[PDB]
Symmetry: C3
Subunit: 333 residues, 3 copies
Amino acid sequence: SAFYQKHFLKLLDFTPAEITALLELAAKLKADKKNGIEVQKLAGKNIALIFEKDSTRTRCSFEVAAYDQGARVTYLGPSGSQIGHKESIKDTARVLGRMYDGIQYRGHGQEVVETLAQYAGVPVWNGLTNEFHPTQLLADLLTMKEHLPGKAFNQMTLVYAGDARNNMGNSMLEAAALTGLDLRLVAPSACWPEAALVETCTALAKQQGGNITLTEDIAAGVKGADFIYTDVWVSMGEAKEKWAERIALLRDYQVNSAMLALTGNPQVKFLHCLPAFHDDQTTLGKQMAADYGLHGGMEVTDEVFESAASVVFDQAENRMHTIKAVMVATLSR
Amino acid sequence: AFYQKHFLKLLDFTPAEITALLELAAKLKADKKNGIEVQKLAGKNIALIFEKDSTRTRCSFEVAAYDQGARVTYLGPSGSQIGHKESIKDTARVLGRMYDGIQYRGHGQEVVETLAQYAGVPVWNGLTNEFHPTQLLADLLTMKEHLPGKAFNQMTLVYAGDARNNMGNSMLEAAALTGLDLRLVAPSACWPEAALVETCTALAKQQGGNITLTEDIAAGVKGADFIYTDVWVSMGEAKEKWAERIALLRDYQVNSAMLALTGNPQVKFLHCLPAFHDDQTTLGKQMAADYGLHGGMEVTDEVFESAASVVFDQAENRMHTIKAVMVATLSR
Amino acid sequence: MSAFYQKHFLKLLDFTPAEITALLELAAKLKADKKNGIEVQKLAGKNIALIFEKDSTRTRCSFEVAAYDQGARVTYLGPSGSQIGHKESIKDTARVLGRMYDGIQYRGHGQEVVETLAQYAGVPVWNGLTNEFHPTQLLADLLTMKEHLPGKAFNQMTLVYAGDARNNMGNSMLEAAALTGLDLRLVAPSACWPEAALVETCTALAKQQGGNITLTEDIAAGVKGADFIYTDVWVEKWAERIALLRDYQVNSAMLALTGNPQVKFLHCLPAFHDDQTTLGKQMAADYGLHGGMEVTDEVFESAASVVFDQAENRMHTIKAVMVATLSR
Ligand SMILES: [Br-]
């Protein structure tokens, strides 16, 4: 169980038994705080948080985890020039490494984070890159374990519905490759991940006791699901015209009550990394209902999001406990 | 009995509770001045939501937190305001799972009301369009310190300028709870909503006070123990809107002649800040050249710098009263 | 040492040589204490405001980490909206912050700003960089020079700054020689020399301490016998400054001309040495600056380069300033 002074760049750098140990430490740390017996292992330690792109949830998780454990943080938010434009990453890592005990990087390509790791001389943790999002996956795996206790991940069935090509989709293939989940990607074929990545993650997951299924057939795809998972269909970085065709393509794949009933599982739980477009009284939600008929929600309805099946807020809380585990395990012995 | 309650506006409390809160601010001010502050918020994490910037409010919350042993996460203005893309409810519930208390500053009172309904932890209004309670906490403690022998219902407070805003609304609230003799000295298009005026005037009268709205400066300021003002213009509004507000309000500039009109040599000057009193700042120079505003705008440099002016006691007191709010609501 | 309590740190010339030496010995103490896990926090209960009117990741991290190690808390007030003095007066800013904070760092625009904050704050104000002076960097550099050239007093050392010196870095070089007796050479084009009255003031003070200050376009004469070589980034308009300054690049040839194979290289950072960066590929492609700009990557990564010790020592010296001016 030695993560000490290791990096945390992507969940694939670890074995199933290590991810399990990291999750058990997070559950202990979580329980420790709930019971007011939290032992700080990071008193004296200073952490730098590089954010080349904004994410509040990920910042607050790193900040609160550090504070609970007694560390102090410097938040280095977006400043324009990405590292490697004007100044080499080599140079950034060696200056921060002299000064900080640990470095979170959230931003662009995995090549960036991997270079920062090689030169910092201190643990580097990936809060998100274009390619991998291991803190979010950790948090999802901990939530899944808490609500379906006593079952290995290869005793579980996960549905991810909607657009499986985006960065959260690839994380699902990563999750099943390492844990052996029974994974079902319920999406229109235009939004399927690259077939090569699919062939290769299925083999890894098959060898781990699970499978990966890609299908446009919702009623078949979701049978037996323990958890349904979705994310937003569109991006504020594209125009109105792009939204129209994404919504027409994907609206049939909305997680709604009828989808959940198609599972045949009365204890199915619902997951969403957030932010979620479920409330049609927001400014954007009122436009989407008026323009596209999306009353009651988009990728997930308000009824499901607010139902007892929804654990999205346990899931968000767990960002913090899992990130705390990463930092305690890589910075203290 | 502020434990786990919110701080959204002054009239969510009784006079005796506000009095209890002011005496706590005084104790925590004295404890820090004497070097014997007791950290009550150690282990607490606080989130500061700033949809609009205000360094005075940010620093007051940061230093009070830090003095009490807490840690803070400052969420500055960032893209789309809460409730545009993501539900207020969702922001509330995610923050509440991670933080022990939340400060909000930005837009409508309904935003901070929703945050408080769904966060599960105390939520403190650091300023909305409609109310600004922590500022008025500081002003009341400042007033008590500078007239320590008088009760609030023995004091006369003039607020001059434009009162159709969160400051005018909060003056009314404060008068309702303390019995102040409150004069809003302003043009008639600049008075707060009649309904709120009516409600607070009846309450002020029961606490031994009054609320008078008038365009008549000389009668308005007669007897003032304190004169209070704020800037006439918000940055980012059109040039025509600056020129119409200046034309309408410049007669209500707090200047030496207005202080003299009180007949009170002891009269003191308050201003929530920032203030436009210095015609040598870059903006001061543009307003002096364009509108003739030499000597300052809503208040003159002479008044601002004079012994009458207690604006920086008032700024410090932002921190101490905000500390009492957090201490009172986060610990028992 | 309590002679420092409640003082400002606006520029080196506000101090005596003995006082500068006191701040360095404290910096070395605090650095050795950290290395050994025996740092004693002097700043518990203290809150510090960092006014950054211009971005500087190195200066900010140094101040934050120094604060945190000593048990203080910080409020980073970075760039947002209008600068101090545009809408609100410097004085007003100083008097509000001074009521809530135990000290104020300022970084950004002119020296009159930091000086007005210090006049009115009522608490210690530290200059983290103005257009005219950059004293915390020079402290870090002085400590770095003493560490890598141990058995020598400052007035027995020869330091060269190469590049553009008509700015806060040349000005502060002048200050450091005036306070320590360095044998200081500024090796730069004639259009890149600092103001003459500062040169004159500092040249005498330096002579009273056993050193000299020399300004020359002549590189071989300028860098002869140097113990250290220092430079900084030179920067259309870009093109005016490159052609003017590229012959003053610090490369293997320039260090050879010192005749001192123990010469060390200093750079305040950030540095343009890597020609594989987005900017570095554009500068090689468009101006023929292969292998770097004001310092070649060969010098930058050589055993002669001590830039990352210099950078760490930003923190230790900023720590010493804040400990000496805040704790009685
Ligand atoms: Br902190």
